[PDB]
């Protein structure tokens, strides 16, 4: 007993998405993909900072980025490849006095549901935060091992039953429970309207710097890989007072709301893995949450 957790214990990320490159298409002209360019407009304004009152007279020529659709294409296309990898129970930096006990404590994990919610967050449009808002038509095409799947009307908040997501979830759960990998090429086509302004992900700027950096690969608007990884693991409906699916965190913590849902109420990942290697009976939902964290990965040492 009293199997104390290793200080070096970490797990690798098992859902690896690429950067979500963003293109402009039409709804019936889906093959002509023109890359959405981040424009950048200059704004003239004096600097106002707390530490330098002497520098407020002149300076701060700032040039803020923006990204709209072109005025001939009404559909935004978002392309990214989500790579699910198996052996989520292998610790990369941990070892096997604790990670092997985790293997033999989370073998009864229903990966079917875990994978369903992953592919449902892929398909329903959780990966399209501010640009699925106000779109009159949502479409998702998933290409997986030469199989094409079409999704039109999936409400993203609840994980309802559709056999299309389920079909992919099968091979995704077979990867995640076993050994190997699977790759889902996900292209989202959302009809926002003619010249509607799109929403790339944001680089962190300083308190000063410029107003807003949109995410650029080679000049073209895109969204962060870790931001999509936040979308995919947004499956946590099993904490106490669970209203909406949150991103599976080791503490159940969302930064933008200023509260942590699983921290400080004995449902955090660390107490559940210590309970698993000390062998108390877990329910299915918290064990699924622990396996979702191990799929997410991260260093758990102290």
């Amino acid at each position: 007993t009293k199997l104390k957790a290793p200080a070096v214990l970490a797990y690798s990320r098992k859902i690896n998405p690429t950067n979500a490159l963003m293109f402009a298409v039409n709804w019936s002209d889906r093959d002509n993909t023109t890359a959405v360019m981040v424009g950048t407009k200059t704004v003239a304004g004096t600097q106002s900072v707390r530490g330098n009152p002497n520098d407020a007279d002149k300076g701060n020529i700032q040039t803020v980025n923006f990204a709209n659709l072109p005025h001939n294409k009404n559909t935004l296309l978002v392309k990214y490849n989500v790579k699910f990898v198996g052996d989520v129970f292998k610790a990369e930096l941990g070892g096997g006095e604790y990670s092997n006990t985790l293997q033999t404590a989370l073998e009864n994990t229903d990966f079917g549901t875990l994978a369903y919610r992953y592919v449902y967050n892929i398909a329903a449009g959780r990966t399209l935060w501010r640009n699925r808002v106000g779109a009159e038509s949502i479409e998702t095409v998933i290409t997986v091992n030469d199989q094409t799947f079409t999704f039109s009307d999936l409400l993203v908040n609840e994980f309802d039953e559709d056999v299309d997501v389920a079909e992919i979830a099968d091979m995704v759960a077979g990867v995640l429970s076993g050994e190997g990998f699977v790759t889902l090429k996900v292209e989202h086509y959302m009809l926002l309207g003619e010249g509607s302004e799109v929403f790339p992900s944001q680089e962190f700027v300083e308190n000063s710097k410029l107003s807003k950096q949109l995410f650029d690969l080679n000049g073209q608007a895109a969204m962060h890989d870790q931001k999509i990884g936040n979308a995919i693991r947004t499956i946590d409906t099993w904490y106490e007072d669970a209203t909406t699916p949150i991103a599976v965190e080791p503490y159940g913590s969302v930064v933008r709301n200023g509260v942590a849902y699983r921290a400080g109420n004995k449902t955090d990942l660390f107490t559940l893995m210590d309970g698993a290697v000390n062998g108390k009976s877990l329910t299915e939902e918290d064990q699924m949450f622990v396996t979702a964290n191990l799929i997410r990965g991260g260093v758990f040492g102290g």
Binding site: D160, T237, D241, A242, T243, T283, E284, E285
Partner: protein
């Protein structure tokens, strides 16, 4: 005054207010002292309850319980009872537990039947939501409430353990709480210590649901010491499990409406007792435990 409720189907639950209950001409009668004296039918009655301003005598009590009519003491409306006997087969020539109790207790033993009946009690919470539609309340068949209902049904059906069932309980109850807060334009969280009108009206309605669930469990001879969902150390968990059938369907819209107009507690009592009388909520709980126990 007097009033009539039903349990199985026959009008048998009779609540007496204001009337001293005595015996005249060898028959049990009652004297609304605020008026006259009326007799009580015997063949169609088994349950008699006594509200405020009411005194029964020993000889009337003996004749009442000697003819199969069993007596309980309650708050006004007959939906919060604090004093009764235990239901047996017949109250004269035998003293054995009720079939319903025995069935319940065997259901209690098998943990698989416990899980199964837990499920059935949760299903009937959703059934109550529908059956008992409110004019002032939200529609149940709209997209958000039906999405919550099918999410709860899919969660209960696919559940294999009790902890997942209680997690689904928490998310269903909050979801209905946040949706009724959504339509009433408030930011409501369920706290029993909270001093606003919505929470304390919900707490009072929960107490009246506990009382009517206690009457429904007592009416079939089943003690409230056998919780389906709640833990084995929770005192009176079965009365909480029975009251959860009507708590999210009847107590919640009545309490939110009565906090919306913001009137006092006595006509909130009157609204709750009137809603229990008109749609026979105690009868539906009786038939609920009927279809729970016999299978």
């Amino acid at each position: 005054m007097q009033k009539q409720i039903l349990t199985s189907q026959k009008r048998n639950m009779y609540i007496l207010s204001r009337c001293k209950v005595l015996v005249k001409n060898g028959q049990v009668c009652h004297l609304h002292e605020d008026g006259n004296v009326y007799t009580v039918p015997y063949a169609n009655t088994v349950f008699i309850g006594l509200a405020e301003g009411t005194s029964i005598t020993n000889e009337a009590m003996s004749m009442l319980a000697a003819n199969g009519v069993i007596v309980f003491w309650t708050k006004g409306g007959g939906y919060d009872m604090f004093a009764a006997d235990i239901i047996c087969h017949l109250p004269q020539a035998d003293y054995r537990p009720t079939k319903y109790m025995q069935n319940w207790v065997r259901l209690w033993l098998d943990e698989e039947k416990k899980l199964s009946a837990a499920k059935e009690i949760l299903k009937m919470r959703v059934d109550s939501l529908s059956t008992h539609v409110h004019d002032f309340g939200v529609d149940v068949e709209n997209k958000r409430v039906s999405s919550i209902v099918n999410k709860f049904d899919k969660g209960v059906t696919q559940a294999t353990s009790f902890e997942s069932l209680l997690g689904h309980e928490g998310t269903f109850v909050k979801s209905l709480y946040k949706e009724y807060a959504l339509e009433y334009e408030i930011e409501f969280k369920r706290d029993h210590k909270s001093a606003d009108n919505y929470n304390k009206f919900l707490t009072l309605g929960n107490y009246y649901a506990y009382g009517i669930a206690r009457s429904s469990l007592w009416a079939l001879g089943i003690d409230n010491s056998f919780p389906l969902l709640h833990g084995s150390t929770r005192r009176g968990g079965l009365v909480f499990d029975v009251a959860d059938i009507i708590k999210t369907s009847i107590i919640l819209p009545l309490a939110f409406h009565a906090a919306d107009q913001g009137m006092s507690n006595t006509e909130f009592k009157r609204s709750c007792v009137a809603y229990f009388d008109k749609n026979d909520i105690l009868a539906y709980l009786i038939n609920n435990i009927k279809r729970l126990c016999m299978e």
